[PDB]
Amino acid sequence: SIFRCRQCGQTISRRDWLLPMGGDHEHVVFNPAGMIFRVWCFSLAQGLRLIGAPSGEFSWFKGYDWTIALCGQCGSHLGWHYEGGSQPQTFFGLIKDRLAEGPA
Amino acid sequence: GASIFRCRQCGQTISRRDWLLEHVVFNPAFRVWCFSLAQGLRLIGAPSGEFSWFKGYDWTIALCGQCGSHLGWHYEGGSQPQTFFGLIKDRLAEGPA
Amino acid sequence: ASIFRCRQCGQTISRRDWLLPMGGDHEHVVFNPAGMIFRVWCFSLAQGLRLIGAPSGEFSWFKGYDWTIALCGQCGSHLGWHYEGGSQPQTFFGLIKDRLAEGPA
Ligand SMILES: COc1c(N)c(F)cc(C(=O)N[C@H]2CCC(=O)NC2=O)c1F
Ligand SMILES: COc1c(N)c(F)cc(C(=O)N[C@H]2CCC(=O)NC2=O)c1F
Ligand SMILES: [Zn+2]
Ligand SMILES: [Zn+2]
Ligand SMILES: [Zn+2]
Structure with missing residues (x-):
């Protein structure tokens, strides 16, 4: 759950x-x-530090600008925060293998 | 971010x-x-009409030629166009040119 | 050809x-x-392990399954957990990748 x-x-x-953005989370x-x-x-995340100012270059998600999202504690690159778009205006895309899932 | x-x-x-x-x-x-075009697949087996989603086309299985993952199908035997590739969105990664 | x-x-x-692939990925x-990670x-299956303890549902990583600790039956190394009591599949193993070595059959 967390x-x-x-x-x-x-x-x-x-x-x-x-x-689920476009049908799938x-x-x-x-x-x-070339990194995959x-x-x-x-829809929401916490404990990140968003670094720099948004950019639309190479955005995977149509209509969104991204900012790099580090772990606020350790500085590890956990993904990106997306803004500037519509429905929703903002969301997080996090790299699944940099997270650990577990009890609440 | 999504042209290739x-x-x-x-x-x-x-x-x-x-x-x-x-x-x-x-x-x-x-x-x-x-x-209309693809590369780097290997098309395997004989074309089949069974449950073809596209009217008047027969399909052949399309694997990634590099690792063998099933990416979709190649369609032939129809008209306008004669042939095309139908690839599974969830089996692809998208990225810049 | 890999074990x-x-x-x-x-x-x-x-x-x-x-x-x-449980929930979309293996x-x-x-x-x-x-807090151990x-x-x-x-x-789906395994062999040569020894499952210890009665199954427990508390804190299961996989909803609808109970777990038991799995040790190597030969040397006693803690290799992961066995899961049971669910459906499709009924049972399966979660093994600690870093404690296995992959190699030819
Ligand atoms: C600006 O040139 C780069 C270089 N040079 C790079 F080394 C990495 C990236 C990079 O990872 N961008 C992500 C940001 C998030 C998004 O949605 N798409 C992307 O492609 C990048 F953009
Ligand atoms: C019962 O309290 C504990 C303590 N104290 C512990 F030190 C370790 C565990 C432990 O590793 N649990 C696993 C079992 C397998 C699973 O699916 N979820 C888990 O969270 C644990 F539950
Ligand atoms: Zn961290
Ligand atoms: Zn491949
Ligand atoms: Zn052993």
């Missing part, structure tokens, strides 16, 4: 907050450095 | 947005993208 | 053919109530 940072245990999200994507990510979309 | 399509499992290049030709379908128990 | 062996003693435990990163791979 998602923590796999590296340090920082509280990040919850299964209840998963968000899970999206498999690659960046221009299994991204889980969440 | 690759195998989800291993990252083999399969197709591109320029070749798109999102059908939601039900097998007899998918969000399929149709493409 | 998983106990990393400590070499006993054959499971097969790659038996990898099971790999789950999980944490127990003492494990990277678990799900298999």
Whole structure:
């Protein structure tokens, strides 16, 4: 039921907050450095630090601008916060294998 | 971020947005993208008409030629166009050019 | 052609053919109530383990299943857990990937 940072245990999200974007909470994507990510979309997250200013370049999600989301505790790259869009205006795409799932 | 399509499992290049030709379908128990062209698949078996979602086309199984994952089907025997590829959205990764 | 062996003693435990995508993936990163973090791979079957204890539903990572601790039957290394009492499948194993060694049949 709760998602923590796999590296340090920082509280990040919850299964209840998963968000099916275009029909599915899970999206498999690659960046221009050819890294493949299994991204889980969440309506809400906490315990992150969002770094820099949003950018629309290479956005996987139509109409959204992204900011890099680090673990606020350990600094590990956990995914991205998306904004600037519609329905919803904002959400988080977190890298599923950087999280640890467990009891509430 | 979404002009090239690759195998989800291993990252083999399969197709591109320029070749798109999102059908939601039900097998007899998918969000399929149709493409005019693809690469890096291996098409296996003999074409079959059984439960073909596309009227007048027979299908052949399309595997990723790099790792063997099942990515969708190749359709032949129809008209306008004669042939195309129907790939399973959830088996692809999307990314930049 | 791939089997998983106990990393400590070499006993054959499971097969790659038996990898099971529970909730969409065979790999789950999980944490127990003492905050220990494990990277678990799900298999339908296994062999050469010894399940200890009565099944328990408390804190199960997989809803609708009870768990029992699974040790290597040969050397006693803690390799994961067995799950039972659910449906489709009724039972399966969550094994600690870092405590296995994968290799040819
Ligand atoms: C700006 O060039 C880069 C470089 N050079 C990079 F090394 C990595 C990225 C990167 O991971 N971007 C993600 C951000 C989130 C999104 O939705 N799509 C992406 O593709 C990137 F954009
Ligand atoms: C009963 O309190 C404990 C203590 N004290 C412990 F030190 C470890 C565990 C433990 O590892 N539990 C696993 C069992 C397998 C599963 O699916 N979920 C878990 O959370 C545990 F439950
Ligand atoms: Zn962290
Ligand atoms: Zn592949
Ligand atoms: Zn052993």
